[PDB]
Design a protein around this ligand. Structure first.
Ligand SMILES: [Cu+2]
Length: 129
């Protein structure tokens, strides 16, 4: 389960988010893609050794951030944390973090489900502020 913390944050602020990516298969995780929630504006990322980071804007003006491994990736028994800054929406809402975790066999785990789903996305509760 890919979790973006803090799981609660104030509307209208810049927040320092940390995405934690645990290994869930005995296979290297080689890439992670995080869709920015609607109304969350990505600002900057923090460099991590062994990873190259890039942003991509799509037709619907949605933004995804990609961390790609350059030196083995996340191996069995490991997790890695990826920190970035984003501007929160200006109203209270549920910001859902759709994450895509790429393993070395070419498989992809889509953490995009709801509460009851097998691969759920994590959520930041954006509160009034
Ligand atoms: Cu989890």
């Amino acid at each position: 389960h890919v979790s973006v913390k803090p799981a609660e944050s104030a509307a209208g602020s810049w927040e320092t988010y940390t995405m934690k990516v645990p290994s869930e298969k005995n296979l290297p995780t080689t890439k992670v893609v995080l869709k920015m929630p609607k109304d969350v504006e990505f600002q900057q990322y923090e460099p991590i050794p062994g990873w190259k980071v890039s942003t991509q804007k799509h037709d619907d003006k949605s933004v995804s951030v990609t961390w790609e491994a350059t030196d083995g990736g996340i191996q069995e028994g490991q997790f890695q944390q990826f920190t970035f800054v984003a501007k929160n929406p200006d109203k209270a809402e549920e910001a859902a973090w759709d994450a895509y975790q790429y393993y070395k066999d070419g498989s992809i785990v889509e953490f995009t489900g709801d509460e009851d789903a097998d691969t759920p996305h994590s959520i930041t509760n954006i509160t009034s502020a």
